[PDB]
């Protein structure tokens, strides 16, 4: 036999029913299907590394590298989806599978020397050359809906965004999956491509929970928010303590 | 989400083509089908524990307890199968799955200070043994024809050792089947305990004039125990199918 060994593994049984803590996932609909979000895979891999290290995720700065999404995961209206995460033996590589089929691959590891400066927002050489006209929340999600990205309330975290989709303000509700998804939504917002494009690859993602808590601010209505910047030129989306580099999307 | 954690896992990608070291598995056919043997699950679970302990199986005396076989694994025409073993976190429990479906559960653990005393104990020739088994629906090809001789009542005999734990232990299950009063086609669904001690096994093996290595096997209905070499099987339960 060809034998493959894993230093640790975990299984996450996902239930989208009304009373489930994962009910929020029903608000992530793309081309009329409820898709488990790419950032949900990041969350369960992060939780698996945290378990292997004996840490809480909120105390675990983490790096993902060379993430590849091999297929989409449909969440049915009724039943449960079981996603398995495996950490490869003597390696930083990980796999996510469903019913044995590979869904995600990549490398994941504890970030030993978190650099708060990584989360500084990138700056152009000169200010904005055309006058920026901010779009409100409902306008943002209209535009997204028209192109096939149907986000219900739990995934509507973009409160405002620039006309070019290069800056905005994201809600924080102590949910890493939806926060990080709204960073990907911002990356999509300013794209000129037509139709539904879904993430297939991400070169690197850095998360530092301490820097995140510092970068959050509170609005007069007590909502917590973080500012987001997208540089398509630099292949970078940054918000709070999350830095996403080299997002690639493909027609779906 | 409900989260389940595992201290270790391993995936065994099995190919039964003639080029593969696992070709021998094509000789374990039941009711016309190539069935992955229950003792093959024991083998891959043992190998997974050995990996976690930094040991080879030959240095790992091992106990299985409360084994439950939830379904049979019939190999496809492709002749391939992928079996995953998970060791549960902070526990002796294990799972074997195929395509996410649970195939085997139970407990497995390193046997500290094995006690060799556990293994202390007209005929039917090999061809007659396998004629009888075939009449009941058990089709064993040459790699699984390890019963050399058996008692007329099927409660004692000699088993060949071909440096194959899977086929050796399968022939112990075969002896259990041979002497049963029920002659239908039954597959294992539960085993209360299996002890394996490679050291006692090497001591129990003996060589015949032709240089073949063998071990004596005993089946005790009173005790529901089958013992051979350094393997002790207790509480084998089989059901029809």
UniProtKB/Swiss-Prot annotation, chain B:
Annotated positions of the N6-acetyllysine modification: 131
Record-annotated PKS/mFAS DH domain positions: 8-241
Active site, per annotation: 28 (proton acceptor), 170 (proton donor)
Tissues showing expression: Ubiquitous. Prominent expression in brain, lung, liver and mammary gland.
Region (C-terminal hotdog fold): 122-241
UniProt PTM comment: In adipocytes, S-nitrosylation of Fatty acid synthase occurs under physiological conditions and gradually increases during adipogenesis.
Subcellular location field: Cytoplasm; Melanosome
Region of interest: N-terminal hotdog fold: 8-116
Self-association state and partner proteins as the record states: Homodimer which is arranged in a head to tail fashion. Interacts with CEACAM1; this interaction is insulin and phosphorylation-dependent; reduces fatty-acid synthase activity.
Other notes: The relatively low beta-ketoacyl synthase activity may be attributable to the low 4'-phosphopantetheine content of the protein.
Role: Fatty acid synthetase is a multifunctional enzyme that catalyzes the de novo biosynthesis of long-chain saturated fatty acids starting from acetyl-CoA and malonyl-CoA in the presence of NADPH. This multifunctional protein contains 7 catalytic activities and a site for the binding of the prosthetic group 4'-phosphopantetheine of the acyl carrier protein ([ACP]) domain. (Microbial infection) Fatty acid synthetase activity is required for SARS coronavirus-2/SARS-CoV-2 replication.
Protein name: Fatty acid synthase
Organism for this UniProt entry: Homo sapiens (Human)
Lineage, top ranks: Eukaryota, Metazoa, Chordata, Craniata, Vertebrata
């Amino acid at each position: 036999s060809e034998n493959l060994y894993f230093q640790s593994a975990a299984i996450y049984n996902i239930d989208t029913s009304s009373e489930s803590p994962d009910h929020y996932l029903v608000d992530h609909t793309l081309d009329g299907r409820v898709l488990f979000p790419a950032t949900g895979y990041l969350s369960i891999v992060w939780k698996t590394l945290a378990r292997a290290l004996g840490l809480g995720v909120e105390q675990l700065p983490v790096v993902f590298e060379d993430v590849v999404l091999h297929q989409a995961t449909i969440l049915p209206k009724t039943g449960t989806v079981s996603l398995e995460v495996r950490l490869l033996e003597a390696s930083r590589a990980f796999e996510v599978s469903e019913n044995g089929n590979l869904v995600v691959s990549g490398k994941v590891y504890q970030w030993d020397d978190p650099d708060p400066r990584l989360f500084d927002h990138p700056e152009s050489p000169t200010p904005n050359p055309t006058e920026p006209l901010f779009l409100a929340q409902a306008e943002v999600y209209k535009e997204l809906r028209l192109r096939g990205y149907d986000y219900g309330p739990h995934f509507q975290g973009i409160l405002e965004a620039s006309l070019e989709g290069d800056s905005g303000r994201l809600l924080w509700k102590d949910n890493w999956v939806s926060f990080m998804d709204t960073m990907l939504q911002m990356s999509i917002l300013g794209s000129a491509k037509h139709g539904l494009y879904l993430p297939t690859r991400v070169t690197a993602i850095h998360i530092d929970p301490a820097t995140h808590r510092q970068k959050l601010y509170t609005l007069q209505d007590k909502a917590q928010v973080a500012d987001v910047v997208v540089s398509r030129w630099l292949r970078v989306t940054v918000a709070g303590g999350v830095h996403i580099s080299g997002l690639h999307t493909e027609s779906a």
